[PDB]
């Protein structure tokens, strides 16, 4: 279809200086009256004036109070309004339009829409054009004066960006409010909300200027008591940006608003952040533990955009990673500091190495700054976001904390109030880098390849120790696989954070150092290394790469036990698991294909199993860490290492491994499950929505992981423990009782009990839906059909749709049924959903991303469903672009 290219970027021939809106909300229509105070830029060459405007019903068009007429001075085709150049003035002018739109039937949740009884907007990326005409792109920065009117009884709270400057009554039971947002902004940061909303509020005093900021968080009345953690997390985010970056908030007021129907997590509209209710609302008796982490990171992320996205914005959409990667990095820094648990960093690594590495070896592979797009919407990707953040975090690793803060400050100062590009950020970091090296010839020109080159680098190692010289060498190689974006791949600037562990006593042998690999290969030599070390490589996960440590399992075990760095310990464990998984996978696959009547499996390493026991029995070791060591790598991590994957054979492989370990450790697992109870489920802070003990949350996580293992093993009398756990007041515990009960006939009683506990809270019923959807059940397909008919019905709430289907698609055995019925079922949902919400339909395609990694029968089934979906008449441009790229047609 229509393809935009990065190299084709040109500034506009026009400038929009001021936007003055009247948004008049009525029962069956919203009327939008808009004045744009415009001018011609220095780049103008007498061209037609072309506005974006999608699905708008025009009442009137004028320029300087002169009415323009369809077919004579303009054309409109439901996408673009063209004003012929003859009637475009040559100096300052006022463009006026009035259009009609229909929030009430906008089920796509982009533009102006209705979520339950709340009228709300979503404008990023290209939603403003669905409200009114605009040059709808992020370099068209302007100031906004916004009046909203509505029925007073139905819509008493009216909000738009900035200072509320007047409130007034209107005949017929209506009323209005006017806002002035003094900060120049692109139109994707416009927002408006109208509803019967309740709030909590507080005053925050900024650290340096002592500015008073009123903080408001809003929801529908039913869930006002679920707003407190959000408000606290906002106070935390504000203090962190002050403390780490020196950044203060810059309006007198900041509103956060929860709505039930939202396509993603939240949105950074200036002074008016709008959230999926699942990422703003919690209470301890009606939310699982993970809701608290999600709210903290999502509130954080939107707050951090106030500088990284708002005060410094994007020149064009190809720069998305500049705000999202950098904001993800700020959010992860925030989250690591607020949680103070090593699991937080690990969880970011886990997400990258599963979901993002898969994307990066898929036909969807792109660099973090793409070269082209059809729907910009399809480039809000784990690549742009999570690889983006790892790339932004490497600057911190390379520079250190003080020179990182210096380079960041150069960036944010220089480009304040303006657009920026990835080059501008690298330029700023390069200034810091020269200062740190004390050499004005040092440069970061090689660093740009992190923005332009797709694919995951493979970093491999060889070691040599000379005992006479006490000298140790690490020889390092990097390789990125050629792909459709580059047929030849260049070496990157890869920072390798390293230590060296003495295997005799388990201690540190050097001060930690960062090796700067800039070539295809290099050898780093260390002197005064008193015995042969074991290397601790890529500490903290210091670059976004496949690590081939070339260590034995014996050396990996010593790192798991004695290394200081949590990532290296975890990764060493991960590698032991992977070696075992690939070996047994190959054993089962050969036996299956050869139709063998007998064959052998390589047992799980017995010293590894002893090391897992020793960690678990250590009462001073971290409980979150322990939950990571007893869990195999995720399926989407594993698939990155297998071509032609038989999912059945993998499910058999994983079961054998877990069985082998549990045959040794179940008694330890049980004993720990019981000993952890007192501290794990202690009710300190249970009534305090302003404080969360993350260490204690990790103890519950560990208890629940162990309970799953023991349930699946049918450990004696474990059902009793399951029934007791179902009575815990923590929903994390009592929903776990449901999933782990899948292995017993009590499942359907716990299904009904947990349903009853869940059904009167919108968000809790959604967590119940996911718990059911991921239940390890033989009858999962009949359970899905029960969810559809009894609970989902014909809901258009993306949270409901996502809750029912996505966890099921991670069921390795059932979703990949060799019949293809899983693939068919999800395809039908995608196509159904695409007729009203193209964005959500494409999110539901995620399970197909690995199609060309599967065995050839499963490839064929997925491929047939994808081509079928592509044959759907009126398929959205979103879904079509996605499926065309995914099936190697584009
Ligand atoms: C396809 C799609 C669907 C919904 C929303 C958008 C605009 N994106 C947006 O607000 N992105 C979030 C990311 C989400 C996972 C929450 C963001 O970074 N907000 O700051 C897009 C582009
Ligand atoms: Mg319309
Ligand atoms: Mg996150
Ligand atoms: Mg609902
Ligand atoms: Zn963001």
**Dist CA 818 CA 654 (whole Å):** 18
Domain boundary among 435, 454, 473: 454
Q: Which residues pair with 535 in a beta bridge?
A: 500
Active site residues: 302
Residue 263, token pair as written in the block = 């396509």
**Residues 735, 740, 743, CA angle at the centre, nearest 5°?**
140
Q: What is the atom index within ligand 1 of the atom nearest the CA of 843?
A: 1
The set of residues, in sequence order, having a beta carbon less than 8 Å from that of 696 and lying 6+ positions away, is 679, 680, 682, 684
Clarify whether residues 310 and 216 are in a common domain. no
Q: What was the elucidation method?
A: X-ray
* Domain containing residue 518: CATH number: 2.60.40.1840
Does residue 3 lie within any of the structural domains? no
Query: b vs e for 542-554, b when ≥16 Cβ sit within 10 Å of the residue's Cβ?
Result: bbbbbbebebebe
How many Å lie between the centroid of ligand 4 and the Cα of residue 793? Answer: 10
Chain center to CA of 775? 24
**Dist CA 725 CA 734 (whole Å):** 6
What burial class does residue 833 get, using C-beta atoms within 10 Å of its C-beta: 0-12 exposed, 13-18 middle, 19+ buried? buried
Cβ contact 548:521 at 8 Å: no
The set of residues, in sequence order, having a beta carbon less than 8 Å from that of 320 and lying 6+ positions away, is 314, 369, 376, 379, 380, 384
Residue 638, token pair as written in the block = 């594993």
Q: CA torsion angle for 297, 299, 302, 304 (degrees, to 10)?
A: -70
Is the minimum distance from the CB of 420 to ligand 1 under 6 angstroms? Answer: no
**Dist CA 330 CA 308 (whole Å):** 9
**Dist CA 123 CA 108 (whole Å):** 12
Residue 617, annotated as binding a ligand: no
DSSP notation for 182-223: EEEE-GGG--EEEE-EEEEEEEEE-TTT--EEEEEEEEEGGG
Helix, coil or strand: residue 122: strand
Cβ contact 492:457 at 8 Å: yes
Q: Do strands 266-267 and 253-259 pair parallel, antiparallel, or not at all (unpaired)?
A: unpaired
How many Å lie between the centroid of ligand 2 and the Cα of residue 86? Answer: 29
Q: What is the resolution of this structure in A?
A: 2.1
Residue 695, token pair as written in the block = 């260490």
Cβ contact 573:549 at 8 Å: no
Domain boundary among 239, 266, 283: 283
* Domain containing residue 434: CATH number: 1.10.390.10
**Dist CA 248 CA 245 (whole Å):** 9
Cβ contact 198:219 at 8 Å: yes
**Dist CA 556 CA 607 (whole Å):** 11
Q: CA torsion angle for 838, 844, 849, 854 (degrees, to 10)?
A: -140
Nearest bound ligand to CA 266?
1
Ligand 1: which residue has its CA nearest to atom 19?
267
Does residue 2 lie within any of the structural domains? no
**Dist CA 101 CA 111 (whole Å):** 10
Residue with structure tokens 């809701």?
Answer: 291
Residue 324, annotated as binding a ligand: yes
Clarify whether residues 511 and 611 are in a common domain. no
Clarify whether residues 625 and 747 are in a common domain. yes
**Dist CA 771 CA 788 (whole Å):** 15
Residue with structure tokens 């690939």?
Answer: 582
Clarify whether residues 445 and 540 are in a common domain. no
Cβ neighbours around 371 below 10 Å, total: 15
Instruction: Give pairs for 873-879: CB < 8 Å, separation 24+.
Output: 874/835, 875/834, 876/834, 876/838, 876/841, 877/1, 877/374, 877/375, 877/838, 878/375, 878/377, 878/378, 878/834, 878/838, 878/839, 878/841, 878/842, 879/830, 879/834, 879/838, 879/841, 879/842, 879/845
Residue 127, annotated as binding a ligand: no
Q: What is the largest CA-CA distance in the chain?
A: 95
Clarify whether residues 559 and 540 are in a common domain. no
Cβ neighbours around 222 below 10 Å, total: 12
**Dist CA 609 CA 603 (whole Å):** 11
* Domain containing residue 27: CATH number: 2.60.40.1730
Picking from 869, 854, 361, the residue whose alpha carbon sits closest to that of residue 640 is 361
Chain center to CA of 491? 28
Clarify whether residues 203 and 271 are in a common domain. yes
Cβ contact 343:628 at 8 Å: yes
Clarify whether residues 539 and 571 are in a common domain. no
How many Å lie between the centroid of ligand 4 and the Cα of residue 763? Answer: 9
Residue 373, token pair as written in the block = 């797009």
Is the minimum distance from the CB of 324 to ligand 1 under 6 angstroms? Answer: yes
Clarify whether residues 789 and 886 are in a common domain. yes
Clarify whether residues 221 and 289 are in a common domain. no
Q: What is the atom index within ligand 1 of the atom nearest the CA of 839?
A: 1
Clarify whether residues 648 and 734 are in a common domain. yes
Cβ contact 684:678 at 8 Å: no
Is the minimum distance from the CB of 379 to ligand 1 under 6 angstroms? Answer: no
**Dist CA 241 CA 728 (whole Å):** 37
Ligand 1: which residue has its CA nearest to atom 17?
267
The set of residues, in sequence order, having a beta carbon less than 8 Å from that of 493 and lying 6+ positions away, is 394, 398, 444, 446, 447, 449, 450, 516, 517, 518
Domain boundary among 165, 197, 229: 197
Q: What is the atom index within ligand 1 of the atom nearest the CA of 328?
A: 18
Cβ contact 149:170 at 8 Å: yes
How far CA 136 is from CA of 271, 337, 747, in Å, comes to 20, 37, 52
Cβ contact 198:217 at 8 Å: no
**Dist CA 636 CA 350 (whole Å):** 10
Q: What is the atom index within ligand 1 of the atom nearest the CA of 266?
A: 16
Helix, coil or strand: residue 107: coil
Residue 72, annotated as binding a ligand: no
Per the structure, how many domains does the chain have? 5
DSSP notation for 310-358: TTEEESSGGGHHHHHHHHHHHHHHHHHHHH--HHHHHHHHHHIIIIIHH
**Residues 687, 693, 694, CA angle at the centre, nearest 5°?**
135
Q: Which residues pair with 598 in a beta bridge?
A: none
Helix, coil or strand: residue 562: helix
Does residue 6 lie within any of the structural domains? no
Cβ neighbours around 860 below 10 Å, total: 12
What burial class does residue 664 get, using C-beta atoms within 10 Å of its C-beta: 0-12 exposed, 13-18 middle, 19+ buried? middle
Cβ neighbours around 745 below 10 Å, total: 8
**Dist CA 357 CA 853 (whole Å):** 13
Picking from 140, 139, 134, 136, the residue whose alpha carbon sits closest to that of residue 126 is 136
Is the minimum distance from the CB of 877 to ligand 1 under 6 angstroms? Answer: no
**Dist CA 461 CA 551 (whole Å):** 9
Nearest bound ligand to CA 268?
1
Rg of the Cα atoms in the chain: 28
DSSP state of 645: B
Clarify whether residues 576 and 722 are in a common domain. yes
* Domain containing residue 275: CATH number: 3.30.2010.30
Cβ contact 764:287 at 8 Å: yes
Cβ contact 529:463 at 8 Å: no
The set of residues, in sequence order, having a beta carbon less than 8 Å from that of 866 and lying 6+ positions away, is 827, 848, 851, 883, 886, 887
Range of the domain at 359: 284-454
**Dist CA 261 CA 581 (whole Å):** 41
Helix axes 821-834, 877-886, angle to 10 degrees: 150
DSSP notation for 563-588: -S-HHHHHHHHHHHHHHHHHHHHHHH
Breaks in the chain, after residue numbers (C to N greater than 2.5 Å): none
Nearest bound ligand to CA 279?
1
Nearest bound ligand to CA 30?
2
Handedness of CA 715, 720, 726, 729 (dihedral sign): negative
What burial class does residue 393 get, using C-beta atoms within 10 Å of its C-beta: 0-12 exposed, 13-18 middle, 19+ buried? buried
Helix axes 320-339, 388-399, angle to 10 degrees: 70
Q: Which residues pair with 51 in a beta bridge?
A: 81
Residue 397, token pair as written in the block = 């690793």
Tell me the CA end-to-end span of the chain in Å, nearest whole number: 10
DSSP notation for 714-764: T-TTHHHHHHHHTT-S-HHHHHHHHHHGGGSTTHHHHHHHHHHHHTTSHHH
Residue 492, token pair as written in the block = 């990157």
Residue 277, token pair as written in the block = 């209710």
What burial class does residue 504 get, using C-beta atoms within 10 Å of its C-beta: 0-12 exposed, 13-18 middle, 19+ buried? exposed
**Residues 533, 535, 541, CA angle at the centre, nearest 5°?**
160
The set of residues, in sequence order, having a beta carbon less than 8 Å from that of 846 and lying 6+ positions away, is 806, 809
Residue 305, annotated as binding a ligand: yes
Pocket test for ligand 1, best of 107, 264, 321 (most atoms within 8 A of CB): 264
Clarify whether residues 405 and 269 are in a common domain. no
Is the minimum distance from the CB of 839 to ligand 1 under 6 angstroms? Answer: yes
Cβ contact 239:303 at 8 Å: no
Does residue 256 lie within any of the structural domains? yes
* Domain containing residue 785: CATH number: 1.25.50.10
Does residue 5 lie within any of the structural domains? no
Does residue 4 lie within any of the structural domains? no
Handedness of CA 659, 664, 668, 670 (dihedral sign): positive
Chain center to CA of 425? 22
Residue 473, token pair as written in the block = 């060498």
Does residue 770 lie within any of the structural domains? yes
How many Å lie between the centroid of ligand 5 and the Cα of residue 266? Answer: 8
Q: How many residues in total does the chain contain? A: 890
Cβ contact 673:626 at 8 Å: no
Does residue 235 lie within any of the structural domains? yes
Picking from 113, 111, 116, 156, the residue whose alpha carbon sits closest to that of residue 260 is 116
């Amino acid at each position: 279809p229509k393809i935009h290219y990065r190299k084709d970027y040109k500034p506009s021939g026009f400038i929009i200086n001021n936007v003055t809106l009247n948004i008049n909300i009525h029962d069956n229509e919203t009327i939008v009256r808009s004045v744009l105070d415009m001018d011609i830029s220095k780049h103008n060459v007498g061209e037609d004036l072309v506005f974006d405007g999608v699905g708008l019903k025009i009442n009137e068009i004028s320029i300087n109070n002169k009415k323009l007429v369809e077919g004579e001075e303009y054309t409109y085709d439901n996408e673009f309004l063209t004003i012929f150049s003859k009637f475009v003035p040559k100096s300052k002018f006022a463009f006026s339009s009035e259009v009609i739109i229909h929030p009430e039937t906008n089920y796509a949740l982009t533009g102006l829409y209705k979520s339950k009884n709340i009228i709300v907007s979503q404008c990023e990326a290209t939603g403003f054009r669905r409200i009114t005409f605009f040059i709808d792109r992020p370099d068209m920065m302007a100031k906004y004066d916004v009046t909203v009117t509505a029925d007073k009884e139905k819509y008493p709270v009216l909000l738009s960006n900035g200072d509320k400057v007047n409130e007034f009554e209107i005949p017929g039971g209506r009323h209005g409010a006017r806002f002035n947002d003094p900060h120049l902004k692109p139109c994707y940061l416009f927002a408006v909300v109208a509803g019967d909303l309740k709030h909590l509020s507080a005053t925050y005093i900024t650290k340096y200027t002592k500015k008073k900021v009123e903080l408001y968080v809003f929801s529908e009345e039913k869930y006002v008591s679920k707003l407190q953690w959000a408000l606290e997390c906002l106070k935390k985010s504000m203090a962190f940006d002050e403390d780490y970056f020196g950044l203060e908030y810059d309006l007198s007021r900041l509103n956060l608003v929860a709505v039930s129907d939202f396509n993603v997590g939240a949105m950074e509209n200036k002074g008016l952040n709008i959230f999926n209710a699942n990422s703003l609302l919690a209470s301890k008796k009606n939310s699982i533990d993970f809701s608290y982490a999600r709210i903290l990171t999502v509130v954080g992320h939107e707050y951090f955009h106030n500088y990284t996205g708002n005060r410094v914005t994007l020149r064009d959409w190809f720069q998305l990673t500049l705000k999202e990667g950098l904001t993800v990095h700020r959010e992860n820094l925030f989250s690591e500091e607020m949680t103070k648990t090593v699991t937080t960093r690990l969880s970011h690594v886990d997400l990258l190495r599963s979901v993002q590495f898969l994307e990066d070896s898929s036909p969807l592979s792109h660099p973090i700054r793409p070269e082209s797009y059809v729907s910009m919407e399809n480039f809000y990707t784990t690549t742009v976001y999570d690889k983006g953040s790892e790339v932004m975090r490497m600057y911190l690793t390379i520079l250190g904390e003080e020179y990182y803060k210096k380079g960041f400050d150069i960036y944010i100062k220089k480009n304040d109030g303006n657009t920026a590009t990835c080059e501008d950020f690298n330029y700023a970091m390069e200034q810091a880098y020269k200062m740190k090296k004390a050499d004005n010839s040092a440069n970061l020109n090689q660093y740009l390849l992190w923005f332009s080159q797709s694919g995951t680098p493979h970093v491999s190692f060889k070691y040599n120790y000379d005992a006479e010289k006490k000298q140790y060498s690490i020889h390092v190689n990097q390789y990125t696989k050629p792909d459709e974006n580059q047929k030849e791949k260049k070496p990157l600037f890869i920072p390798i954070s390293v230590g060296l562990i003495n295997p005799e006593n388990g201690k540190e042998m050097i001060s930690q150092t960062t090796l700067e690999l800039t070539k295809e290969s290099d050898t780093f030599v260390f002197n005064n290394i008193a015995v042969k070390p074991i290397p601790s490589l890529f500490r903290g996960f210091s670059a976004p790469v496949y690590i081939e440590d070339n260590l034995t399992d014996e050396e990996r075990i010593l790192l798991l036990k004695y290394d200081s760095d949590a990532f290296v310990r975890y990764n060493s464990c991960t590698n032991i698991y992977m070696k075992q998984i690939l070996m047994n996978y190959n054993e089962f696959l050969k036996a299956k294909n050869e139709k063998l009547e007998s064959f052998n499996l390589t047992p799980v390493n017995a010293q590894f199993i002893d090391a897992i026991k020793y960690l678990l029995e250590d009462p001073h070791a971290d409980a979150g860490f322990k939950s990571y060591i007893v869990s195999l790598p995720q399926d989407r991590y594993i698939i990155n290492f297998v071509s032609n994957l038989d999912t059945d054979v993998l499910a058999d492989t994983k079961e054998y491994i877990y069985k082998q370990i549990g045959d040794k450790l179940n008694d330890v697992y049980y004993k720990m499950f019981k000993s952890l109870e007192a501290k794990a489920d202690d009710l300190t802070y249970f009534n305090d929505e302003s404080h969360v003990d993350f260490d204690q949350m990790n103890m519950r996580t560990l208890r629940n992981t162990l309970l799953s293992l023991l349930s699946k093993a049918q450990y004696p009398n474990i059902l009793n423990e399951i029934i007791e756990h179902s009575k815990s007041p923590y929903p994390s515990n009592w929903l776990t009782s449901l999933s782990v009960s899948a292995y017993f006939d009590k499942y359907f009683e716990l299904y009904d009990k947990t349903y009853k506990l869940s059904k009167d809270d919108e968000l809790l019923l959604q967590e119940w839906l996911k718990t059911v959807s991921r239940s390890d059940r033989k009858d999962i397909y009949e359970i899905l059909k029960k969810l559809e008919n009894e609970v989902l019905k014909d809901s258009k709430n993306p949270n409901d749709i996502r809750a029912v289907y996505l966890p099921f698609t991670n069921n390795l055995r059932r979703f990949h049924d060799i019949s293809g019925k899983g693939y068919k079922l999800i395809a039908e949902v995608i196509t159904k959903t695409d007729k009203f919400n193209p964005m959500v339909a494409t999110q539901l395609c995620e399970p197909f991303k690995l199609w060309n990694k599967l065995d050839t029968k499963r490839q064929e089934l997925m491929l047939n469903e994808m081509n079928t979906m592509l044959q759907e008449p009126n398929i959205s441009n979103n879904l079509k672009e996605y499926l065309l790229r995914l099936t190697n047609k584009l």
